Amino acid sequence: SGLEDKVSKQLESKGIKFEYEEWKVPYVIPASNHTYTPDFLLPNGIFVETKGLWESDDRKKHLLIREQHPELDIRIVFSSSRTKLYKGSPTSYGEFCEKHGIKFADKLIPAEWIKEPKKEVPFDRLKRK
Amino acid sequence: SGLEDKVSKQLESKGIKFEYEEWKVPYVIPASNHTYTPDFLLPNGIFVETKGLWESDDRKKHLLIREQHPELDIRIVFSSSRTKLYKGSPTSYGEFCEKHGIKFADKLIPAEWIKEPKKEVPFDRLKRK
């Protein structure tokens, strides 16, 4: 940077010996608690989230929720699952979902999902509104 | 949204009783591990970070570092300590530092800091670049 150079030029001019970016300090960012509210809950126990732009954080949230709540069946309906993860990415929302076993579809809830046999939803583990 | 509207219309048209944003799924964002590399380390054991823009995440980082490594003396030299935290915020970088006990200066490292008596830095706690 320009700032680092000024400071650097300062110390040297005054003959101050110093160390630069020589040392690393470890630290941990504490685990945090959050909640996610799926857009729709179908009678057969299927949760459905609708999504246009699907940002990095949101993808991680889904991967985390699947790891933490494997008995939850949460699927996604995209305006377009072809959209690429980011600017010049080669990977698309749909591809990502396929890689992680996230069931998805475009524009509307597929007819077959609505018809899957109802399953138990662990509501005790959830918090209402 | 167009997507939430179309999907709920599709559901209503098929007679599906669905709950909308009725349930909160709790989840945890895992603790993460990092390392911070101060820009300079003076002979007397004082570390100095040079900062221009200083974002919300960078600030939060500084507080975690002070908490986890209270044995280190980490100070900040800003391009301007008058800069506001974020657009609209009334609080400046300099006021954030005073509120949290972080020593700071503007543009160049204060001569009086350079002159403070040496304090041994516990390098066993740190990791070389």
Curated annotation (Swiss-Prot), chains A, B:
Highest taxon of source: Viruses
EC number: 3.1.21.2
Keywords of the record: Bacterial host gene expression shutoff by virus, Degradation of host chromosome by virus, DNA-binding, Endonuclease, Host gene expression shutoff by virus, Host-virus interaction, Hydrolase, Nuclease
GO function terms (MF aspect): crossover junction DNA endonuclease activity; deoxyribonuclease IV (phage-T4-induced) activity; DNA binding; double-stranded DNA endonuclease activity
Record carries keyword Hydrolase: yes
An example Gene Ontology biological process: degradation of host chromosome by virus
Enzyme class: hydrolase
Catalytic reaction equation(s): Endonucleolytic cleavage to 5'-phosphooligonucleotide end-products
Function of the molecule: Junction-resolving enzyme that selectively binds and cleaves four-way (Holliday) DNA junctions present after viral genomic replication. These intermediates are created during DNA repair, processing of stalled replication forks and homologous genetic recombination. Introduces two nicks on the two non-crossing strands, at 5' sides of the junction. Also participates together with gp6 in the degradation of host chromosome to provide nucleotides for phage DNA synthesis.
Assembly description: Homodimer.
Protein name, per record: Endonuclease I
